[PDB]
From Swiss-Prot, chain B:
Pathway: Protein modification; peptidyl-diphthamide biosynthesis
Enzyme's top EC category: transferase
Identification of the protein by name: Diphthine synthase
Natural source organism: Archaeoglobus fulgidus (strain ATCC 49558 / DSM 4304 / JCM 9628 / NBRC 100126 / VC-16)
Entry EC number(s): 2.1.1.98
Family matches, as InterPro entries: 4pyrrol_Mease, 4pyrrol_Methylase_sf, 4pyrrole_Mease_sub1, 4pyrrole_Mease_sub2, Dphthn_synthase
A GO BP entry: methylation
Subunit field text: Homodimer.
Length: 252, 251
């Protein structure tokens, strides 16, 4: 009896850890969810890589009907594959909670997550990131409030974009932020497309200027910069994200 | 030719991605550093898993003398292994910048990071974490100021503890914070030992009370809680971190 949460990493089947791959091969039953995020890989591709069957679970199986998955783990060794690192999405912590409360032992096999990837692709300092927010298809005052609060303590803001029913692009998120608060248009930001693919599109400029960029296909994430930049951060954005020269005004 | 940064993940040799392992096998030269963090495995145990020699680099090789590693990568396929993810420290982005300026192609194979593993072990919401800080063995007002700035926006604080010359434990970190600002003693915090080991020691209590816990050997990390908690965070801290009932006052 066991429920193991296994991170898939960011892009394809080889992003799983060796420990994770071993856990999936050892598992009695293997499930996957593509609600909290998604990978390039399809379920057949995963099946050929693992050499065993993989069953896709939907949103209801992770929320209201989470008891079903947990019931399977009362008599078998079950694996739930999640894009990225398990528990970055709050959903998983609730599943784990329910499971432990029902006496089912859990285990988490960690994966690489998008925040991390954004730091290596941009050169922004991970310790400088403040709270994150999700820009939803439905208007909200939340992303703007989080950005302002983070700027108040000189911290960056990682923005995740809506995935459902269709993935939102950086262009739509810029529009959304500016509609909510006109002052967002001149804040410097970085758009990142397909983080983890190795063929990312990364561009830093004033927010409104990111609508001019062809970010390619989703998934997309954005970063709104802090009030200031460390000189190393400035140098890295200039080299990795094609930032304009006037970004140096953020360096104190 | 190629300079690939590869995260090792959190605890042992199998924490590396399958892509990371293939990159190490395809590389001409493989280097590792235990300066930014470290895993349980020794250099010899990595060499056994990769089936090839792995050369350990020191701080000077990663900082002022990084041009040496970059020169190797101009004619060979080079891998630099780093505990956790390679760019969660700030050390490594400087190497990447220097390499790209010299026209050397770089690639990053991401790994699991502590910065995200604490959420799975505690039930704290990742989106509520604010800026992180490192508690150094020497006195500094930095960690306390970061904690305070994060609580001003109602955010959690991840605290990394000094690794040199030896790794700092939660007990010493508590002493340090309370010496810097006595009010730190009553703030709720979570001590986490050996995150990623699967055998972690996790405990949530007022800061001063964490000195009562036997967290065992390093490495240790801590979280200082935000001003309030979501009800689900409280529920998870009570089930996973043996939090005291009085923590519900933060809900």
């Amino acid at each position: 009896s066991l429920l193991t949460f296994v991170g898939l990493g960011l892009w394809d089947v080889k992003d799983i850890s060796v420990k994770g791959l071993e856990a999936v091969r050892e598992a009695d039953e293997v499930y996957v969810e593509y609600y909290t995020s998604k990978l390039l890989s399809s379920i057949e591709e995963m099946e050929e890589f693992f050499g065993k069957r993989v069953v896709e679970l939907e949103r209801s199986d992770l929320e209201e009907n989470s008891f079903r998955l947990i019931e399977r783990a009362k008599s078998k060794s079950v694996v739930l594959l999640v894009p990225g690192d398990p528990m970055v999405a709050t959903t998983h912590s609730a599943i784990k909670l329910e499971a432990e409360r029902k006496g089912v032992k859990t285990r988490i096999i960690h994966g690489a997550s998008i925040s991390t990837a954004v730091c290596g692709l941009t050169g922004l300092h991970n310790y400088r990131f403040g709270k994150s927010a999700t820009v939803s298809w439905h208007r909200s005052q939340t992303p703007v409030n989080v950005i302002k609060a983070n700027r108040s303590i000189d911290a960056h803001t990682l923005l995740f974009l809506d995935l459902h029913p269709e993935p939102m692009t950086i262009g739509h998120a810029v529009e959304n932020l500016i509609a909510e608060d006109a002052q967002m248009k001149d804040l410097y930001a970085v758009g990142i497309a397909r983080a983890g693919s190795g063929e990312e599109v990364v561009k830093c400029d004033r927010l409104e200027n990111l609508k001019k960029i062809d970010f390619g296909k989703p998934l997309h994430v954005m970063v709104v910069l802090a009030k200031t930049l460390h000189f190393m951060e400035f140098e890295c954005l200039r080299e990795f994200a094609d930032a304009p020269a006037e970004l140096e005004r953020l360096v104190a």
